[PDB]
Design a protein around this ligand. Sequence first.
Ligand SMILES: CCCCCCCCCCCCCCCC(=O)OC[C@H](CO[C@@H]1O[C@H](CS(=O)(=O)O)[C@@H](O)[C@H](O)[C@H]1O)OC(=O)CCCCCCCCCCCCCCC
Ligand SMILES: CCCCCCCCCCCCCCCC(=O)OC[C@H](CO[C@@H]1O[C@H](CS(=O)(=O)O)[C@@H](O)[C@H](O)[C@H]1O)OC(=O)CCCCCCCCCCCCCCC
Ligand SMILES: CCCCCCCCCCCCCCCC(=O)OC[C@H](COP(=O)(O)OC[C@@H](O)CO)OC(=O)CCCCCCCCCCCCCCC
Ligand SMILES: CCCCCCCCCCCCCCCC(=O)OC[C@H](COP(=O)(O)OC[C@@H](O)CO)OC(=O)CCCCCCCCCCCCCCC
Ligand SMILES: CCCCCCCCCCCCCCCC(=O)OC[C@H](COP(=O)(O)OC[C@@H](O)CO)OC(=O)CCCCCCCCCCCCCCC
Ligand SMILES: CCCCCCCCCCCCCCCC(=O)OC[C@H](COP(=O)(O)OC[C@@H](O)CO)OC(=O)CCCCCCCCCCCCCCC
Ligand SMILES: CCCCCCCCCCCCCCCC(=O)OC[C@H](COP(=O)(O)OC[C@@H](O)CO)OC(=O)CCCCCCCCCCCCCCC
Ligand SMILES: CC1=C(/C=C/C(C)=C/C=C/C(C)=C/C=C/C=C(C)/C=C/C=C(C)/C=C/C2=C(C)CCCC2(C)C)C(C)(C)CCC1
Ligand SMILES: CC1=C(C/C=C(\C)CCC[C@H](C)CCC[C@H](C)CCCC(C)C)C(=O)c2ccccc2C1=O
Lengths: 504, 53, 44, 492, 41
Amino acid sequence: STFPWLTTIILFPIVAALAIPFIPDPTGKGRPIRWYALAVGLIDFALIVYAFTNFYDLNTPGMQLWESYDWIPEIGLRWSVGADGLSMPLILLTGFITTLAILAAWPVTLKPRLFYFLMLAMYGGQIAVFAVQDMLVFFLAWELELIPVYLLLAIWGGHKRQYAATKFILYTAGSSLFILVAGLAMAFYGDTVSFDMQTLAAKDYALGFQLLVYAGFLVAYGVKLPIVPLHTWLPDAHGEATAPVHMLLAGILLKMGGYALIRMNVDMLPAAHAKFAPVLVILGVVNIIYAALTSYAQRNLKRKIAYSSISHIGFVLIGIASFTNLGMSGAVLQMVSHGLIGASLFFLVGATYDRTHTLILEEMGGVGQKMKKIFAMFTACSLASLALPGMSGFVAELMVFIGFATSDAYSLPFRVIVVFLAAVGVILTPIYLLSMLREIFYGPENKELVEHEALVDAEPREVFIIACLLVPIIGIGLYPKLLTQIYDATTGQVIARAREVLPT
Amino acid sequence: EVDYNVVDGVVNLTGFVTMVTGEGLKYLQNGRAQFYALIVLLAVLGFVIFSVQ
Amino acid sequence: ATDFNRGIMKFDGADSPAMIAISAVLILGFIAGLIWWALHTAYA
Amino acid sequence: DLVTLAGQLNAGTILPETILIVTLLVVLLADLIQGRQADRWTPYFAIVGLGGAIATMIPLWTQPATISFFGSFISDHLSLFFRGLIALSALGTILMSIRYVEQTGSSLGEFMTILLTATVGGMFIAGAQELVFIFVALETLSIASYLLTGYTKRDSRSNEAALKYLLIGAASSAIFLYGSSLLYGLSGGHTQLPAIAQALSSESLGLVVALVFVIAGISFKISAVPFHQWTPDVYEGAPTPVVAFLSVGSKAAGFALAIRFLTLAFPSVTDQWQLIFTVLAILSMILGNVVALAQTSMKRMLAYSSIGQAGFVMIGFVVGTEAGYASMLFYLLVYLFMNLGAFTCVILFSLRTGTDQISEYAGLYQKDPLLTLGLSLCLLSLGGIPPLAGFFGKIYLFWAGWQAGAYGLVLLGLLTSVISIYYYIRVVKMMVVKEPQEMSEAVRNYPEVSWSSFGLRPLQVGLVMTVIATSLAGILANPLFNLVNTAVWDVP
Amino acid sequence: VISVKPILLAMTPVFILLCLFFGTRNGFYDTDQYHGNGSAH
Ligand SMILES: CCCCCCCCCCCCCCCC(=O)OC[C@H](CO[C@@H]1O[C@H](CS(=O)(=O)O)[C@@H](O)[C@H](O)[C@H]1O)OC(=O)CCCCCCCCCCCCCCC
Ligand SMILES: CCCCCCCCCCCCCCCC(=O)OC[C@H](CO[C@@H]1O[C@H](CS(=O)(=O)O)[C@@H](O)[C@H](O)[C@H]1O)OC(=O)CCCCCCCCCCCCCCC
Ligand SMILES: CCCCCCCCCCCCCCCC(=O)OC[C@H](COP(=O)(O)OC[C@@H](O)CO)OC(=O)CCCCCCCCCCCCCCC
Ligand SMILES: CCCCCCCCCCCCCCCC(=O)OC[C@H](COP(=O)(O)OC[C@@H](O)CO)OC(=O)CCCCCCCCCCCCCCC
Ligand SMILES: CCCCCCCCCCCCCCCC(=O)OC[C@H](COP(=O)(O)OC[C@@H](O)CO)OC(=O)CCCCCCCCCCCCCCC
Ligand SMILES: CCCCCCCCCCCCCCCC(=O)OC[C@H](COP(=O)(O)OC[C@@H](O)CO)OC(=O)CCCCCCCCCCCCCCC
Ligand SMILES: CCCCCCCCCCCCCCCC(=O)OC[C@H](COP(=O)(O)OC[C@@H](O)CO)OC(=O)CCCCCCCCCCCCCCC
Ligand SMILES: CC1=C(/C=C/C(C)=C/C=C/C(C)=C/C=C/C=C(C)/C=C/C=C(C)/C=C/C2=C(C)CCCC2(C)C)C(C)(C)CCC1
Ligand SMILES: CC1=C(C/C=C(\C)CCC[C@H](C)CCC[C@H](C)CCCC(C)C)C(=O)c2ccccc2C1=O
């Protein structure tokens, strides 16, 4: 218990990435590089599992692993790490998703050195975001992921990727513009200039100042998390990409903006959270409605699944402002289920893109007459994505609906209107995913699609990744009490504080 | 069509007015030498004009 | 524009400004009215 | 000699400047006696002399602050830090100029004499309490920057830019000299600034007129917004090590002169020029980071980036807290290494290829990985990537600006940085993103991937040292903040 | 109540062991089977 674990887990890919430019002579395509990176990711996930199964307890509602390191006697940059209740499954999802994305990146030929170096650099930042417990080092870790994913989407993507990459880096800079201001504003109020996280939650502010701080938080969190006025970056970001970077794009990177959206805007200030809770609920409803109606008319194969990320994060945007213990506990499960569904679905889309070069739903008419494992895996992943109860998406939306049904201060009109609108939202959301599977596979055999390109049936390696990605969703949806006890005390303390602050 | 035109054109319009603002502000450097000293003397006079009033 | 109407979504008015302008202002008007109604209705 | 006159003269805080003068004399005598065949030990001897001048300041650091030459020179930790900054600029200028001058065609010793003269003038102007001493050192630096521009020997761009720079500098020097004579005439006749600032608490309009007429010639040297009309024409036609010295050494000299002169002269009218400095920074950052988006030349892009980044230092000079000048002292120390690496990579790319257009930058990932690696690792530090030291400087700058009470300045600085990252990332987009069969001509026939001809190894190891320094200053800056903060509390 | 640690510590070593065993399994990216460098472009 006296040994630093999370610091070495963060620093180990950053140290191990220096051996990627070394590389004694393979005389080939770069197979020792991926064979070293897969072993590094495997032992990092093993260290994460060994650190989770021993020292993390389920009794103390605070932070089990508390390690503080004085970096400088200056401003207040302090390496203080801490694992919470609703952040502990996030690191185990991060390591698992990044390990399977490293394992899924076999056909890399054009510059694999910089690819695996940026992969090992992003894997350090994806743990350094969730493991930090500061205000300035959190902004540093938020701006740490600015360059590598933008560089990967620049050096490879679909067509006209240069217009999308500059828009993505300028959108991320506009997101990071407000974080330093909103972090210094709450820190410069009164006294205790040091940037400890436990002291910033005990401070008292005025009403209009808290409204301005919550507005500066919500602007950046609406730029990051896609809502209907600020989601124009996401088709250009998540449509023009390849599979192993799209796994990390559609997995933990979207939940990073939702974890801080809970942790800051509920624990730091809940007084201004209740005044923007109907606005956030209505924005999530309009997000859920607009994503399906936009993705149904789209003809691109990848944007049709990229808008499902908006359609699934609208449920989190609804369940955040429910003011209920079950509604707060279901949001983390919905985020984990959406990440595990979207990473598998986008890896499958990037896998079937190599077998059929045209990304049009009209010419794809007879791709199911030769390969059957691909069609079976697509049907299984789609049925896991729509509404199925064996997977945990139905359990998560049921938790959201039950937590929103028994609420307060929204008695007669608001609950029934939001429930009736989310019901037609879940009417609308399987339509495009059904129409895509009806148009691509179900049909006659196209002669020109076989004459132009030749498709080969899938490997047993491609079965293994989907078999590893599908079983935790079924394990959570069959028994939802495994994820409940991890953050039950933390969500109970959060809802108790939010109901103590909220009057009447 | 609304999502492709209306909410998408605002960012492109801000980028376009930023680009033409940069163009119209780099058009000022003509290359005349004594016009630069005239601008310098105008700034020197305008500093006292703004600081007195 | 050109790569948006190739399947079963082909119509006559798709890129005309006079239809998409009134459709966009109707959508934004209902969005603003719903936000204003949910703000003035809840917590009461 | 007499011990009493030598004790009353106090000539002990002048030794590195006399070592540099002796080094200049030995270099000039070796150029006069031997000639052109002795161009292999003279810059190494000058580097040894600069190191011996920068190493003897350690006994001068642990010394009490005393005045010298009867209240003419003041020796503090700030003046020693500025002298070390100017010496580290000059040594990197020598390391980048050793191959460039002999590739140009002129003799190296005649350039190194004027370079050491400008270094001695910068070391003298890093103190500069006395008014006539300020004028003599400023005109010495001005004549040095005049004579270092026309070095290309009848190439049209440098001699066409040098006349415009001479006109603008002579106008600014006449304005500053009229303001200096006005400031001499406003007092009773004293020249020492503690003796001038005691009898200037009357709030006259002539004090404001003299302040504007002095700050015009000051802000010409700082090159803020109302006197930035020389640099986009100067920085393109001048040779690249000359402008590499002038982008950092003259700027730090102007900053030190502004800080020391305004502190020792006007501790009464600070709120009158605080609003002026906010207006200058607000206009300068906007004009630089909006104009620099449309330029297609790389050297003009770095020229306008210098104006866009010179306005961030003014935010630390607007405030009156003790942590404001520490931000400027840290940002200049980071910007020295950043501009040194960004100039060394441009010097290497212009010496190995020729012209240095932006669209020619495609196809650098396969020919020389070290050059594009150093250029990317330096431009990302110039942009503000949090593993690098420029972000660590900008966070302290914005923290001081939000602590003292300047919200709009920090907001405009963040907005201009977000705007400026689009053209800061453009050279990396041209370098590491462009595929094969896409690059322009004169890239496909790179003959000299190895360096073994006439001292290219110091030019390579200087870029390696700059890359290692800007990579290790970001995550390890614990003694640097203490060394900055121990030299800022002496300023009242 | 069902815990997560004894069901995770018994499922992670076979997960570590199967990764390399399925990494040596290939056959689609072997002879030619494709015309491209691996990315989309
Ligand atoms: C509400 C909070 C909002 C927070 C975010 C905003 C914070 C402030 C941002 C600062 C503004 C940046 C100005 C500089 C922009 C620029 O240089 O563009 C240059 C590029 C190049 O354009 C393209 O460039 C291509 C060539 S290339 O890529 O550059 O090589 C070319 O092919 C193509 O034609 C051309 O289009 O333009 C773009 O990529 C478009 C993205 C520009 C990003 C601007 C962000 C401002 C958003 C406003 C808020 C929107 C609100 C929506 C809801 C109403
Ligand atoms: C908890 C709820 C869980 C819900 C799970 C939902 C799964 C939905 C899967 C839907 C797949 C649709 C594929 C349709 C058939 C096809 O075209 O491919 C046919 C190919 C066969 O290949 C080929 O098939 C050919 C036969 S033919 O082409 O189909 O005629 C044959 O000729 C050839 O040799 C052979 O290579 O695929 C297979 O049949 C593999 C089996 C997939 C069927 C899954 C069975 C579902 C079991 C449920 C287990 C519940 C788990 C509970 C956990 C506690
Ligand atoms: C903490 C890291 C955060 C991410 C920052 C990284 C930004 C990306 C790097 C810039 C692009 C560099 C291209 C250089 C070009 C280069 O020199 O190598 C070029 C070299 C060429 O290899 P390839 O086999 O790709 O060559 C092309 C061939 O395929 C021929 O077609 O590629 C590599 O080996 C990449 C090595 C990584 C090189 C980057 C290392 C950066 C180390 C420092 C990282 C920061 C440390 C911060 C402090 C901790
Ligand atoms: C043509 C070549 C020209 C090269 C320059 C000539 C250098 C010759 C003399 C060295 C100057 C430094 C002497 C300090 C070296 C030293 O410390 O000496 C010791 C003594 C100073 O001692 P202090 O009184 O500081 O005592 C220190 C002790 O108390 C500590 O133990 O200096 C002298 O005796 C002064 C008289 C030297 C003669 C006058 C020299 C001063 C005028 C020189 C011109 C100055 C301006 C030069 C820059 C423009
Ligand atoms: C705070 C950081 C400060 C760091 C500064 C660095 C200080 C150390 C730098 C030393 C590296 C320089 C030598 C390496 C250079 C080196 O190793 O390469 C050897 C160098 C190059 O020779 P080549 O190989 O070109 O020789 C000609 C060939 O063609 C034949 O092989 O030749 C020299 O000997 C140059 C003369 C050096 C003369 C040294 C100075 C003589 C003593 C002067 C005493 C001065 C008293 C003070 C002034 C009054
Ligand atoms: C003395 C007080 C000041 C010291 C400050 C240090 C300045 C930096 C070092 C420069 C000294 C000179 C080096 C010249 C080098 C020299 O003259 O060449 C030595 C040699 C190159 O020449 P060779 O002897 O191979 O060539 C023989 C020839 O005849 C073949 O053509 O080694 C190189 O490959 C150097 C590679 C650059 C390596 C640069 C490393 C710099 C040290 C970095 C330490 C990093 C620590 C990182 C921690 C993470
Ligand atoms: C109609 C509805 C039907 C629903 C039925 C579904 C039941 C699902 C419930 C699951 C929760 C189980 C908790 C019981 C488990 C339990 O109570 O015992 C847990 C028990 C722990 O043993 P002890 O407590 O003795 O261990 C103490 C030590 O672990 C201390 O270090 O052993 C296990 O770890 C079993 C190994 C995991 C076995 C996993 C089985 C599934 C493996 C599947 C592998 C994938 C197959 C892929 C095929 C391609
Ligand atoms: C790591 C992780 C995790 C995990 C945990 C757990 C809990 C696990 C598991 C669990 C469990 C306890 C589960 C199991 C059971 C079940 C099963 C076993 C199932 C089955 C299935 C199968 C095997 C099938 C297959 C298929 C089909 C159905 C058809 C088509 C094809 C395929 C292949 C897809 C968590 C959550 C923390 C989160 C994060 C991450
Ligand atoms: C002159 C010469 C040398 C001698 C040069 C050696 C001694 C290297 C000189 C490097 C100097 C000493 C670096 C100085 C280091 C500074 C302290 C760095 C500080 C500045 C940074 C901020 C950049 C060679 O070693 C050589 C090797 C192979 C072919 C030709 C030659 C060759 O022509």
